[PDB]
Amino acid sequence: DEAQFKECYDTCHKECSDKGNGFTFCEMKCDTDCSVKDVKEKLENYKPKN
């Protein structure tokens, strides 16, 4: 297949440019948007007073 995604990419771009962002950035985003990936959590920590 590929159309099921070409519709998500194209359609995502529609709701994407709505953000008022640029087309290109919307592409590289809409690309990874309608698709999974790998992004390990963002570990954190602090030093709260006693």
PDB file of N, CA and C in Angstrom:
ATOM      1  N   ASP A   1       0.870  -1.184   0.000  1.00  0.00           N
ATOM      2  CA  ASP A   1       0.000   0.000   0.000  1.00  0.00           C
ATOM      3  C   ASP A   1       0.894   1.216   0.000  1.00  0.00           C
ATOM      4  N   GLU A   2       0.320   2.395   0.213  1.00  0.00           N
ATOM      5  CA  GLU A   2       1.012   3.680   0.325  1.00  0.00           C
ATOM      6  C   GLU A   2      -0.003   4.818   0.345  1.00  0.00           C
ATOM      7  N   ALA A   3      -1.160   4.624  -0.289  1.00  0.00           N
ATOM      8  CA  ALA A   3      -2.222   5.616  -0.340  1.00  0.00           C
ATOM      9  C   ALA A   3      -2.780   5.925   1.044  1.00  0.00           C
ATOM     10  N   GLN A   4      -3.093   4.901   1.844  1.00  0.00           N
ATOM     11  CA  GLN A   4      -3.527   5.076   3.235  1.00  0.00           C
ATOM     12  C   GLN A   4      -2.651   6.055   4.040  1.00  0.00           C
ATOM     13  N   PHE A   5      -1.352   6.098   3.733  1.00  0.00           N
ATOM     14  CA  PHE A   5      -0.376   7.023   4.298  1.00  0.00           C
ATOM     15  C   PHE A   5      -0.362   8.323   3.484  1.00  0.00           C
ATOM     16  N   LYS A   6      -0.359   8.296   2.141  1.00  0.00           N
ATOM     17  CA  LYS A   6      -0.407   9.492   1.281  1.00  0.00           C
ATOM     18  C   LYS A   6      -1.599  10.376   1.616  1.00  0.00           C
ATOM     19  N   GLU A   7      -2.674   9.784   2.111  1.00  0.00           N
ATOM     20  CA  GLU A   7      -3.824  10.513   2.582  1.00  0.00           C
ATOM     21  C   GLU A   7      -3.554  11.123   3.940  1.00  0.00           C
ATOM     22  N   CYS A   8      -2.879  10.422   4.842  1.00  0.00           N
ATOM     23  CA  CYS A   8      -2.519  10.944   6.140  1.00  0.00           C
ATOM     24  C   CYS A   8      -1.496  12.040   5.981  1.00  0.00           C
ATOM     25  N   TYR A   9      -0.485  11.905   5.147  1.00  0.00           N
ATOM     26  CA  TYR A   9       0.517  12.923   4.882  1.00  0.00           C
ATOM     27  C   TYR A   9      -0.086  14.185   4.284  1.00  0.00           C
ATOM     28  N   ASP A  10      -0.859  14.038   3.206  1.00  0.00           N
ATOM     29  CA  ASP A  10      -1.527  15.149   2.523  1.00  0.00           C
ATOM     30  C   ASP A  10      -2.506  15.846   3.469  1.00  0.00           C
ATOM     31  N   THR A  11      -3.393  15.049   4.061  1.00  0.00           N
ATOM     32  CA  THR A  11      -4.420  15.514   4.992  1.00  0.00           C
ATOM     33  C   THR A  11      -3.791  16.087   6.253  1.00  0.00           C
ATOM     34  N   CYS A  12      -2.786  15.425   6.818  1.00  0.00           N
ATOM     35  CA  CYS A  12      -2.015  15.924   7.948  1.00  0.00           C
ATOM     36  C   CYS A  12      -1.448  17.275   7.576  1.00  0.00           C
ATOM     37  N   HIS A  13      -0.855  17.443   6.385  1.00  0.00           N
ATOM     38  CA  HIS A  13      -0.340  18.722   5.904  1.00  0.00           C
ATOM     39  C   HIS A  13      -1.392  19.814   5.931  1.00  0.00           C
ATOM     40  N   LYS A  14      -2.635  19.493   5.574  1.00  0.00           N
ATOM     41  CA  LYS A  14      -3.769  20.411   5.681  1.00  0.00           C
ATOM     42  C   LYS A  14      -3.949  20.929   7.108  1.00  0.00           C
ATOM     43  N   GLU A  15      -4.198  20.044   8.070  1.00  0.00           N
ATOM     44  CA  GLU A  15      -4.251  20.404   9.501  1.00  0.00           C
ATOM     45  C   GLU A  15      -2.871  20.844  10.043  1.00  0.00           C
ATOM     46  N   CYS A  16      -1.806  20.660   9.273  1.00  0.00           N
ATOM     47  CA  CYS A  16      -0.468  20.994   9.678  1.00  0.00           C
ATOM     48  C   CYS A  16      -0.240  22.461   9.419  1.00  0.00           C
ATOM     49  N   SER A  17      -0.302  22.901   8.161  1.00  0.00           N
ATOM     50  CA  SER A  17      -0.197  24.305   7.776  1.00  0.00           C
ATOM     51  C   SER A  17      -1.169  25.182   8.566  1.00  0.00           C
ATOM     52  N   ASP A  18      -2.294  24.629   9.043  1.00  0.00           N
ATOM     53  CA  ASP A  18      -3.220  25.287   9.979  1.00  0.00           C
ATOM     54  C   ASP A  18      -2.504  25.858  11.206  1.00  0.00           C
ATOM     55  N   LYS A  19      -1.483  25.164  11.723  1.00  0.00           N
ATOM     56  CA  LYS A  19      -0.648  25.645  12.805  1.00  0.00           C
ATOM     57  C   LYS A  19       0.051  26.958  12.473  1.00  0.00           C
ATOM     58  N   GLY A  20       0.041  27.357  11.206  1.00  0.00           N
ATOM     59  CA  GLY A  20       0.646  28.558  10.660  1.00  0.00           C
ATOM     60  C   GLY A  20       2.134  28.371  10.396  1.00  0.00           C
ATOM     61  N   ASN A  21       2.625  27.139  10.537  1.00  0.00           N
ATOM     62  CA  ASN A  21       3.986  26.760  10.225  1.00  0.00           C
ATOM     63  C   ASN A  21       4.251  26.782   8.710  1.00  0.00           C
ATOM     64  N   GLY A  22       5.501  26.489   8.353  1.00  0.00           N
ATOM     65  CA  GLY A  22       5.901  26.380   6.961  1.00  0.00           C
ATOM     66  C   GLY A  22       5.574  25.016   6.383  1.00  0.00           C
ATOM     67  N   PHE A  23       5.452  24.966   5.056  1.00  0.00           N
ATOM     68  CA  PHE A  23       5.153  23.747   4.316  1.00  0.00           C
ATOM     69  C   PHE A  23       6.209  22.679   4.549  1.00  0.00           C
ATOM     70  N   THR A  24       7.470  23.000   4.264  1.00  0.00           N
ATOM     71  CA  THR A  24       8.620  22.100   4.413  1.00  0.00           C
ATOM     72  C   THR A  24       8.653  21.473   5.799  1.00  0.00           C
ATOM     73  N   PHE A  25       8.704  22.298   6.840  1.00  0.00           N
ATOM     74  CA  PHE A  25       8.685  21.828   8.213  1.00  0.00           C
ATOM     75  C   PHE A  25       7.453  20.971   8.471  1.00  0.00           C
ATOM     76  N   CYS A  26       6.314  21.356   7.893  1.00  0.00           N
ATOM     77  CA  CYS A  26       5.112  20.584   7.966  1.00  0.00           C
ATOM     78  C   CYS A  26       5.283  19.230   7.330  1.00  0.00           C
ATOM     79  N   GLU A  27       6.012  19.107   6.234  1.00  0.00           N
ATOM     80  CA  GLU A  27       6.340  17.861   5.565  1.00  0.00           C
ATOM     81  C   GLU A  27       7.163  16.966   6.456  1.00  0.00           C
ATOM     82  N   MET A  28       8.392  17.364   6.802  1.00  0.00           N
ATOM     83  CA  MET A  28       9.286  16.583   7.660  1.00  0.00           C
ATOM     84  C   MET A  28       8.618  16.152   8.967  1.00  0.00           C
ATOM     85  N   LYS A  29       7.605  16.915   9.390  1.00  0.00           N
ATOM     86  CA  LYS A  29       6.782  16.625  10.536  1.00  0.00           C
ATOM     87  C   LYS A  29       5.646  15.693  10.201  1.00  0.00           C
ATOM     88  N   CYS A  30       4.697  16.066   9.349  1.00  0.00           N
ATOM     89  CA  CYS A  30       3.622  15.229   8.823  1.00  0.00           C
ATOM     90  C   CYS A  30       4.112  13.845   8.382  1.00  0.00           C
ATOM     91  N   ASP A  31       5.374  13.763   7.961  1.00  0.00           N
ATOM     92  CA  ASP A  31       6.062  12.532   7.622  1.00  0.00           C
ATOM     93  C   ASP A  31       6.143  11.611   8.825  1.00  0.00           C
ATOM     94  N   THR A  32       6.845  12.077   9.856  1.00  0.00           N
ATOM     95  CA  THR A  32       6.959  11.352  11.108  1.00  0.00           C
ATOM     96  C   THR A  32       5.654  11.394  11.905  1.00  0.00           C
ATOM     97  N   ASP A  33       4.727  12.309  11.627  1.00  0.00           N
ATOM     98  CA  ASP A  33       3.444  12.450  12.307  1.00  0.00           C
ATOM     99  C   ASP A  33       2.657  11.153  12.190  1.00  0.00           C
ATOM    100  N   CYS A  34       2.207  10.855  10.967  1.00  0.00           N
ATOM    101  CA  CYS A  34       1.416   9.676  10.688  1.00  0.00           C
ATOM    102  C   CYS A  34       2.333   8.467  10.548  1.00  0.00           C
ATOM    103  N   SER A  35       3.097   8.189  11.582  1.00  0.00           N
ATOM    104  CA  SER A  35       4.072   7.129  11.652  1.00  0.00           C
ATOM    105  C   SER A  35       4.715   7.096  13.042  1.00  0.00           C
ATOM    106  N   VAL A  36       5.076   5.915  13.503  1.00  0.00           N
ATOM    107  CA  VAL A  36       5.774   5.732  14.769  1.00  0.00           C
ATOM    108  C   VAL A  36       7.254   6.056  14.587  1.00  0.00           C
ATOM    109  N   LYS A  37       8.034   5.900  15.651  1.00  0.00           N
ATOM    110  CA  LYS A  37       9.476   6.121  15.655  1.00  0.00           C
ATOM    111  C   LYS A  37      10.064   5.694  16.995  1.00  0.00           C
ATOM    112  N   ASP A  38      11.184   6.300  17.373  1.00  0.00           N
ATOM    113  CA  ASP A  38      11.877   6.048  18.624  1.00  0.00           C
ATOM    114  C   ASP A  38      12.315   7.370  19.233  1.00  0.00           C
ATOM    115  N   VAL A  39      11.844   7.653  20.440  1.00  0.00           N
ATOM    116  CA  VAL A  39      12.163   8.867  21.184  1.00  0.00           C
ATOM    117  C   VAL A  39      12.115   8.474  22.648  1.00  0.00           C
ATOM    118  N   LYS A  40      13.253   7.985  23.162  1.00  0.00           N
ATOM    119  CA  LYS A  40      13.400   7.678  24.584  1.00  0.00           C
ATOM    120  C   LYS A  40      12.895   8.840  25.431  1.00  0.00           C
ATOM    121  N   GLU A  41      12.377   8.510  26.611  1.00  0.00           N
ATOM    122  CA  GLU A  41      11.819   9.515  27.506  1.00  0.00           C
ATOM    123  C   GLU A  41      12.848  10.606  27.815  1.00  0.00           C
ATOM    124  N   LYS A  42      12.382  11.701  28.398  1.00  0.00           N
ATOM    125  CA  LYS A  42      13.249  12.794  28.794  1.00  0.00           C
ATOM    126  C   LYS A  42      13.370  12.731  30.305  1.00  0.00           C
ATOM    127  N   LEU A  43      14.337  11.935  30.776  1.00  0.00           N
ATOM    128  CA  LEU A  43      14.655  11.863  32.197  1.00  0.00           C
ATOM    129  C   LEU A  43      14.812  13.271  32.777  1.00  0.00           C
ATOM    130  N   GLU A  44      14.582  13.389  34.070  1.00  0.00           N
ATOM    131  CA  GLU A  44      14.655  14.660  34.763  1.00  0.00           C
ATOM    132  C   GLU A  44      14.879  14.414  36.240  1.00  0.00           C
ATOM    133  N   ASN A  45      14.991  15.506  36.991  1.00  0.00           N
ATOM    134  CA  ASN A  45      15.189  15.514  38.426  1.00  0.00           C
ATOM    135  C   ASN A  45      15.445  16.933  38.914  1.00  0.00           C
ATOM    136  N   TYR A  46      15.288  17.120  40.215  1.00  0.00           N
ATOM    137  CA  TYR A  46      15.378  18.418  40.855  1.00  0.00           C
ATOM    138  C   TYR A  46      15.854  18.246  42.290  1.00  0.00           C
ATOM    139  N   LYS A  47      16.094  19.371  42.963  1.00  0.00           N
ATOM    140  CA  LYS A  47      16.494  19.385  44.362  1.00  0.00           C
ATOM    141  C   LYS A  47      15.503  20.215  45.178  1.00  0.00           C
ATOM    142  N   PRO A  48      14.323  19.647  45.478  1.00  0.00           N
ATOM    143  CA  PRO A  48      13.330  20.333  46.280  1.00  0.00           C
ATOM    144  C   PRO A  48      13.891  20.498  47.686  1.00  0.00           C
ATOM    145  N   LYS A  49      13.687  21.697  48.255  1.00  0.00           N
ATOM    146  CA  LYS A  49      14.055  21.987  49.640  1.00  0.00           C
ATOM    147  C   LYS A  49      13.503  20.893  50.575  1.00  0.00           C
ATOM    148  N   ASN A  50      14.030  20.855  51.801  1.00  0.00           N
ATOM    149  CA  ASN A  50      13.533  19.929  52.826  1.00  0.00           C
ATOM    150  C   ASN A  50      12.001  19.975  53.010  1.00  0.00           C
TER     151      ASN A  50
END
